[PDB]
Design a protein around this ligand. Structure first.
Ligand code: SF4
Lengths: 255, 204, 184, 113, 117, 46, 161
DNA sequence: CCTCCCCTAC
């Protein structure tokens, strides 16, 4: 199976030997191998291409795309796969207005200076496009991300078949409620505890300690290259979220 | 049809799962005793955990519930695979079911279901053991005024999932006929107001 | 209730019944309200059928629908069948009592400290390359509990059992008075 | 040795193609040797008349559902029922879908998912 | 009474197929546990047409309660302090069901406190 | 040492049937909790 | 007796194509499997992609129905190469409105599909067929559903050496 | 339509 988009742009399953059983996902020039985007678009494109090549089913692709779009709109994304990274040349720009978004982010950060030809994180989440750095975590309009990150490449890949992805995206005493409240709160608390345990175990590498002052040190880690940090900060924010009002509602119902 | 559909679906699920388990239609290791299978069962009914079998049973029960307005008898036939002959037949009478034209507490409904399922289990226990290795089951219904397989003569351009479900349910049945030492053993059904169900069984 | 033993002279001496947690077991990762409600209705049926003959004290457990931390508050007035609404009016507390997970009952002057066992279980999830001179034996856990009394710290592994904000300047988990009887 | 034909039996002509020459003959006629599956919708609801056109190219995207499948035609002309169905009282019907095999369930259980 | 109890047991065992407990006799006839066990033993006799399974349990020493399964080799028969019939099971799997029971006047032991409304 | 029927006959036929008036049931021994209302449950948080 | 001709033609075409595909008489990926519906059945009915074989089948069906009165048994035999022995043999014996003839044809086709789906696989390039018309060792016989409402009652059964 | 910028293929 193969798709030929344009010159030096193609993707397909490769069989280097007839004895080989599992196909190899070979892509050249499409967004999967291009570092000019976000990991979410690469993962979505790869999954859609694999589904099309294996099952040839457009219904499964549409279902997966609609589910992913709904998750993005709701806000159930990992928040890490939405970070851009492009090289910046601080001295090779003709003018200030011609500089890219990452140059503006670095210039705001300087006022510290980076090195020449650096992949720098830009446009994490949430009026020209010219720039929040991953200021987001200490700080998303899903329509913008969905449309201007997934509609163009998926349309380029699927208009060859003859389907419009944009049409798919266009559609897009009480023991009952309190029990659900406890279910949600306990699931959130257990997830938070698991994240804290993982962080403590990872920080054991440096601390070599198990009791107190190990979790305290692990709580000060701000590594942006690991999804566990994003999950931990999301859980911590959610514990301090509107759930306080939910707890008050449970107290009123219980009384 | 307010609460009748849910209780009827639960009873049909328990009936089918009990018949499958006690006649060795599927390996007993694939069954587990439980009370919740997306619905609070009246007892601890052994329910298979194979996703394909669960989906098949749910689809069959939904089709039967959809056609309930015209079917007066539901039967699960046990047919051998060395030869296409039915050896055991379990008949679930639906003599107008006392249809709710216009509804009772769930406790009595579950008590009656418990009595009927206990009668079924007691009858099934004394039956001789059935070997594994390709014993299978079959579903047959007796209708009053309907004709299936004839809804695909207009190209049936579907618009929503309901139309597709109707088309696939109309075309999922084929016409059969009525067909020694047949032994008939009547069992205990439900005598509650909304649900009047009679239970039968056949041997040989 | 004395229905089985048939010796009332000994059954009538059992003043109270104490449930020390883990009333219901479920996977909180994948669970819905209906099956948990079925389990709680069964528990409420048992309570209603046992309450008129004996008093019941209930403790939250590790897998019970209560806080994941160790100081688990009493369950609720809800989560029980409507047949038990008479016991929850507030005036009837000597026959039914929902209590915090760690508690000190003064049973006829005998102060007893009850723990559902989360602290010892959390200590036992650590492998310590020390104490060469038992492996997963009753003696080893008994020694751990004896050390817990010796250290006057109910929860030595604070990051595992304890949660954020146990208290302000006075942690209740540090012992202030030894009890007569210790239960884990 | 083999199965007897009967008392009086006649035989028809030999088929023109064999097992090995069928694909070559099909390729000679102008058809691909293997007709690979085109992109399709398993759910007829999701059809929505998508394959209309794409940059001046007309695509034929169909569905494998029973509704969208053309009835088997004889002699180049389709065959279908025109008159309304006539239901008869006291009929019996049989489920057509095949339940999962005993061996399939045993294999699924032994894999320990 | 050996007549009302037998009729009730026959009804609950044959008309509506459900296992019958001695506690059911306690709640129905308003009798003590010993009388219920004696009535169950009496119904166990005069049973030439046996169409049910008896669930018998015994009380050992050191306050131990066991359910008999083998029915051929009972360990420590010398330490048995009591042995009776717990229920009559018309099926093979016991699996009883429990419902709300109003123990208004069938209680043999009551707590010192009373429910206050 | 004997069949189950022998044990059932030995035990059930000699039932006491005594002290079971059922009209004046034996009162359970009184056990109280002095901490029901005293003060300051240490583990009661908000 | 008017529409029975067309419905029998369609049923016989489905019969022949199903026998040719489910058995390994002709290779797979040479039949049209996901395009046609036989009798509104939920299953996939295969149709041979080569027009010449389809035309030959149609001529065979027309010839059979031309002398339908004289024939009392129409059968298709499976012959294994290098032995010339009938491994298996599928035989069908011989006021009516649309609905009934349509229904028994649908039921007979469904029964044939059920019987054929659970048969053992057949090796490649080892089987050739032979259609025989009848005018007037250890054998395993299987009884299938046939039409009975119409005056042209047929009996469907299969054999296996 | 124009330049500017990114960066992958060969
Ligand atoms: S970096 Fe990722 S893993 Fe290492 S501690 Fe911070 S979160 Fe846990």
């Amino acid at each position: 199976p193969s798709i030929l988009i344009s010159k030096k742009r193609y993707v397909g399953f490769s069989y280097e030997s007839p004895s080989q059983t599992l196909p190899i996902f070979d892509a050249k020039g499409i967004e999967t191998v291009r570092r000019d985007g976000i990991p979410a678009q690469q993962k979505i494109i790869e999954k859609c291409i694999r589904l099309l090549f294996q099952t040839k089913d457009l219904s499964k692709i549409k279902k997966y795309l609609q589910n992913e779009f709904f998750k993005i709109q709701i806000g159930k994304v990992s928040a890490q796969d939405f970070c851009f990274a492009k090289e910046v040349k601080l001295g090779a720009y003709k003018s200030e207005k011609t500089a890219p978004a990452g140059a503006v982010v670095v210039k705001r950060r300087i006022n510290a200076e980076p090195q020449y030809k650096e992949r720098i994180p830009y446009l994490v989440v949430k009026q020209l496009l010219r720039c929040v750095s991953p200021e987001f975590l200490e700080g998303l309009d899903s329509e913008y991300y969905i449309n201007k990150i997934l509609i163009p490449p998926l349309d380029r890949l699927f208009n060859l078949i003859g389907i419009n992805v944009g049409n798919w995206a266009q559609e897009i005493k009480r023991s009952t409620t309190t029990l659900s409240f406890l279910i949600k709160k306990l699931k959130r608390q257990k997830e938070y505890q698991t994240l804290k345990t993982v962080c403590r175990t990872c920080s054991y590498r440096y601390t070599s300690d198990a009791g107190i002052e190990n979790d305290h040190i692990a709580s000060k880690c701000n590594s942006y290259d690991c999804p566990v940090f994003y999950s931990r900060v999301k859980a911590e924010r959610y514990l301090r979220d509107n759930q306080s009002v939910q707890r008050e509602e449970a107290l009123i119902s219980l009384n | 049809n307010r609460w009748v559909e849910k209780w009827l679906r639960v009873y049909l699920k328990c009936y089918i799962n009990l018949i499958l388990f006690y006649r060795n239609v599927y390996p007993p290791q694939s069954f587990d005793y439980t009370t919740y299978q997306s619905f609070n069962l009246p007892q601890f009914v052994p329910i298979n955990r194979h996703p394909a079998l669960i989906d098949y049973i749910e689809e069959l029960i939904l089709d039967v519930l959809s056609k309930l307005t015209h079917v007066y008898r539901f039967s699960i036939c046990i047919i051998n695979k060395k030869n296409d002959l039915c050896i055991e037949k379990y008949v679930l009478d639906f003599s107008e079911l006392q249809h709710v034209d216009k509804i009772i507490t769930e406790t009595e409904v579950f008590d009656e279901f418990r009595s009927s399922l206990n009668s079924l289990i007691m009858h099934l226990e004394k039956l001789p053991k059935v070997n594994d290795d390709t014993i299978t089951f079959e579903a047959v219904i007796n209708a009053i005024e309907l004709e299936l397989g004839h809804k695909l003569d207009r190209n049936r351009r579907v618009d929503s999932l309901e139309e597709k479900a109707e088309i696939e349910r109309d075309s999922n049945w084929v016409k059969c006929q009525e067909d020694p030492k047949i032994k008939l053993t009547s069992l205990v059904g439900s005598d509650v107001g909304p649900l009047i169900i009679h239970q039968f069984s056949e041997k040989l | 209730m004395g229905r089985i033993n048939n010796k009332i002279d000994d059954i009538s001496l059992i003043g109270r019944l104490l449930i020390c947690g883990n009333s219901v077991d479920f996977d909180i990762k994948s669970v819905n309200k209906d099956e948990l409600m079925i389990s709680l209705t069964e528990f409420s049926k048992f309570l209603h059928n046992i309450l008129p003959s004996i008093s019941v004290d209930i403790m939250p457990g590790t897998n019970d629908p209560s806080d994941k931390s160790l100081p688990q508050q009493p369950f609720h007035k809800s989560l029980f069948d409507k047949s038990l609404e008479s016991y929850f009016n507030g005036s009837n507390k000597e026959i039914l009592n929902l209590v915090t997970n760690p508690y000190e009952f003064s049973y006829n002057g005998v102060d007893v400290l009850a723990v559902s066992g989360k602290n010892i279980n959390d200590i036992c999830k650590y492998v310590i390359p020390s104490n060469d001179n038992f492996k997963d034996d009753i003696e080893h856990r008994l020694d751990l509990m004896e050390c817990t009394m010796k250290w006057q710290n109910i929860a030595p592994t604070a990051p595992d059992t304890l949660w954020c904000y146990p208290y302000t300047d006075k942690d209740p988990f540090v012992l202030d008075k030894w009890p007569h009887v210790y239960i884990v | 040795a083999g199965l007897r034909y009967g008392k009086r039996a006649f035989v028809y002509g030999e088929p023109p193609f064999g097992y090995q020459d069928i694909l070559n003959k099909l390729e000679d006629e102008g058809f691909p040797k293997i007709d690979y599956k085109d992109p399709f919708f398993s759910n007829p609801v999701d059809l929505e008349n998508k394959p209309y056109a794409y940059a001046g190219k007309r695509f034929e995207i169909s569905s494998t559902h029973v509704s969208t499948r053309i009835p088997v035609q004889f002699g180049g002309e389709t065959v279908s029922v025109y008159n309304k169905p006539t239901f008869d009282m006291f009929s019996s019907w049989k489920y057509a879908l095949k339940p999962p095999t005993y061996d399939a369930v045993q294999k699924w259980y032994n894999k320990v998912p | 009474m050996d007549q009302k109890a037998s009729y009730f047991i026959n009804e609950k065992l044959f008309t509506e197929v459900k296992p019958v407990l001695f506690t059911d006799l306690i709640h129905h006839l308003k009798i003590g546990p010993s009388m219920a066990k004696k009535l169950m033993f009496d119904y166990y006799k005069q049973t030439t047409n046996a169409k049910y399974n008896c669930v018998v349990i015994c009380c050992y020493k050191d306050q131990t309660i066991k359910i008999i399964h083998d029915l051929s080799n009972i360990p420590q028969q010398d330490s048995i302090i009591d042995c009776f019939i717990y229920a009559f099971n018309p099926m093979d799997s016991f699996i009883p069901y429990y419902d709300i029971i109003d123990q208004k006047d069938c209680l043999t032991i009551k707590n010192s406190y009373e429910l206050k409304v | 040492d004997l069949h189950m029927d022998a044990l059932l006959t030995k035990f059930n036929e000699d039932r006491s049937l005594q002290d079971e008036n059922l009209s004046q049931p034996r009162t359970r021994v009184r056990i109280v909790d002095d901490n029901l209302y005293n003060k300051s449950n240490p583990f009661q948080l908000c």
